[PDB]
Design a protein around this ligand. Structure first.
Ligand SMILES: [Mn+2]
Ligand SMILES: [Mn+2]
Ligand SMILES: [Mn+2]
Ligand SMILES: [Mn+2]
Lengths: 231, 236, 231, 234
């Protein structure tokens, strides 16, 4: 099988090459990563770029979705699109605005299977050598799914297991803190907080428990419980 | 009721004031719009300044925010609290189908909903809209939305000249990839991306409705979970 | 004469239309405004016919998906031949060191480079916004005197909110003091506030001095950055 | 003396480290460069900056990666490493000749240093090749030697050919342009315009553009004052 690997962090992220290497154990790997929708207003420029295992690669001056569209052109046919490993979580409400997820979604929109990968972080750096067996296990599992699939994956720095999950959906409380710069000019701090603890079975909960979280995603944002007849 | 009006095109967009004026027929309206990401800025302080509403528009207390549309919502709920409804738009440009995912206009409405309020995004597929002629339809759509059980989150697209209204579902089409190489006047190479949908928009969808000249109203969910694959059968 | 009017704040800015109307008292006006500051090269620019505001004289106009300089290049093409390029009225000052990187000035300079006369107009502020109805007589007076100059000219104009006079001026060139105040983001990570300040008051006769006095400042600009005194 | 080195291309540019290493032959070098590739000091929000490490193969220079503009780097650099005697910006990967000087972030950083009362110089290399910094090192050293004997403070814009054969003090090339608009349509029939304005004549002898075409390192002293004083009493 032929795999396109991309991301949101750009062609220099160590997360990108960790994903490329893991994927190479399952098929031929090609890389196209940024230097979130597909650019159509103007043309995009992309350039051959060296990998750090050698992977044919292009650094694209466009969005992660542009990378997918270009990658299909440069390396078609492609069977699977993998996006990440993003340095930083992509959990719950974060999925909406994730560039990493957008690339995987684009792949899905083109009729391919796809998955996004992110590692939640904060004060510690990802040890990709340590994460490798968990990446391979995850990939192995995703490749056993009925195709095509679209999955959002988050891996704790040091996994203890794997769980399929629902997206965490929590209400938020707005918090705004007025203030002023050392020069007296006014500004505002925003620190909205979730109203409750992440629920069991959710991506956020799973990661906090030390488990790899894999959430299957839907493309249809329609709330069918509110659809209406014509009046 | 108190209404916070925002948008993604900025404080000078005629679409913003059209929405604020329409909304004023239903309650107290306050404006917080960007001076020019769709998540709330938390890593650092954001600037916001009192802003004079346009001369040829009713007065509206207003702030121009140096942040995202979602920041405007967070800020607006603080300065004009309490707020019952968040209206975002009217965006100069459509927000249909796959577009909803990346819309800053929608992100603002969604933020209000994440805070527990009712919210709607409004967009016009563009020519340039004639908000004088769209007013009656903006009023009709708003009246209709205000009869809904609360809270609600709806994405509205008004064609340039509406001939009706329809509740619709989001168009979700598969696309075929189309890349066309080219070179600029200087001989440098580039790539045109022109992906195309595999089929015509289906009836009942937002794209179809707008193409038929109808105002489209799609109720949106926040949960992106594909609930049919939580316990997937795995090949042997 | 035929006048091309553009700006940096965009097609919806009230300062743009204030300048167009004023300019219409001196020749046929055409508008091309933004929907970087150099002309976009070997990279397609989009432009659309645009309707002039309800409460304003009719003006053929286009909104351009590009830079102020692009507006000038495209404007001379769609409305040729043009004799004068006016840029503004910018919402914000363009005094002293600010001129160098000003987008409003960049458009006027582009017009000069194409062999035409041009002027940039800006209204400094911070507290309130401009009342272009009040400034109209002063805009008309400025334009009138500007149009008695030998052509081609390149002039930078700053009009205080409530002007009580007009003076030709030279750009203020002050030395600045570096001021940096450390701070912390929510995670305790460090960031820095910058508040550089001028070392002395603006010299008499300079653009910044004139505005502080309440006068409309008109500075003729050079295109040559060479410091001949050191060659 | 103490030298702050920055650039427009960012902390990973080979151009930045070539300049830093060359400057190190003349004083203590400190680096503050953009996290990634406007030009004014940021005052709206505060700016983040992080200590940046030196690789195994290179000499160590205290350095910070700055999430702001080249001018922010100079302001921050003066704070974290002050007092600083000189500000060097570059070596930019691309030219900064003639009209380009106006919109150059490389030049903006040098100019910021000058506005702070320090001597400063911007360095750029017109490139379809990859600059050979080992081959340009001698020219960087010679140029610095020349700059360091000038009366201070100074502000100079330097452009080095890929393979220089000499050095020349020059004036900025200033040419009138001819507008060229070539319409087109994208694959979906939608119209657009190509801009290809061209200078009305070839670069004059003595100018920075001419010098570089000849194979010479071009050094142009710049002025901060944009006033055209020949038209003050029109
Ligand atoms: Mn990312
Ligand atoms: Mn918009
Ligand atoms: Mn401006
Ligand atoms: Mn550069």
């Amino acid at each position: 099988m032929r795999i396109l690997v991309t991301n949101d962090d750009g062609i220099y992220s160590p997360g990108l090459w960790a994903l490329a290497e893991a994927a190479s154990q399952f098929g031929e790997v090609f890389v196209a990563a940024p230097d979130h929708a597909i650019t159509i207003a103007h043309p995009v420029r992309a350039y051959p770029h060296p990998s750090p295992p050698h992977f044919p690669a292009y650094r694209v001056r466009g969005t992660p979705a542009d990378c997918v569209a270009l990658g299909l052109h440069l390396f078609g046919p492609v069977d699977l699109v993998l996006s990440g490993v993003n340095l930083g979580s992509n959990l719950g409400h974060e999925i909406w605005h994730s560039g990493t997820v957008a690339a995987a979604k684009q792949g899905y929109l083109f009729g391919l299977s796809a998955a996004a990968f992110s590692v939640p972080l904060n004060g510690e750096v990802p040890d990709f050598a340590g994460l490798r067996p968990w990446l391979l296990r995850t990939l192995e599992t995703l490749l056993r799914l009925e195709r095509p699939f679209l999955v959002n994956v988050n891996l704790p720095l040091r996994p203890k297991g794997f769980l399929w999950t629902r997206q965490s959906v929590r209400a938020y409380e707005g918090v705004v803190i007025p203030g002023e710069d050392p020069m007296g000019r006014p500004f505002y701090w925003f620190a909205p907080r979730p109203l409750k603890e992440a629920e069991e079975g959710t991506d956020r909960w799973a990661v906090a428990q030390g488990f790899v979280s894999a959430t299957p995603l839907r493309l249809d944002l329609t709330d069918e419980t509110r659809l209406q007849p014509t009046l």
